[PDB]
Amino acid sequence: FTLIELAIVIVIIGILVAIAVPRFVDLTDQANQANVDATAAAVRSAYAIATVQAKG
Amino acid sequence: FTLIELAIVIVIIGILVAIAVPRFVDLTDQANQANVDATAAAVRSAYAIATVQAKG
Numbered sequence: 001f002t003l004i005e006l007a008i009v010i011v012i013i014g015i016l017v018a019i020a021v022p023r024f025v026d027l028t029d030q031a032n033q034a035n036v037d038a039t040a041a042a043v044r045s046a047y048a049i050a051t052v053q054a055k056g
Numbered sequence: 057f058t059l060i061e062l063a064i065v066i067v068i069i070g071i072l073v074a075i076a077v078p079r080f081v082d083l084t085d086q087a088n089q090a091n092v093d094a095t096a097a098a099v100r101s102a103y104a105i106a107t108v109q110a111k112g
Contacts, residue, residue, distance in 0.1 A: 041057075041058050042058060044057075044058075044061075045057065045058040045060055045061040048061055048064075049060075049061070049064060052064075052068075
């Protein structure tokens with residue numbers, strides 16, 4: 001590579017770095033809560049259906 | 057409520073409706089006739105008792 005091409009590369013690397021980038025976040029607490037809540041809704045419906053099947 | 061529970065409800069409502077149900081009927085004519093007849097029997101007895109009391 002010519003020295004000019006390396007100079008251009010040295011410039012552009014410095015500009016394509018110094019972007020923002022997202023953090024990874026452990027969102028499993030929020031997702032676990034929604035899983036527990038959705039499951040609780042399912043248990044209530046499953047119970048209601050069971051009261052008809054059981055006739056009691 | 058879950059969509060399944062609502063689906064089950066939509067089914068069962070449609071089946072617990074479409075029973076027969078009795079009409080109310082104005083049976084007061086038949087009851088009034090029986091009242092008049094029972095009262096007429098009472099008047100006859102009250103009259104008969106009165107003929108003894110009155111000695112005439």
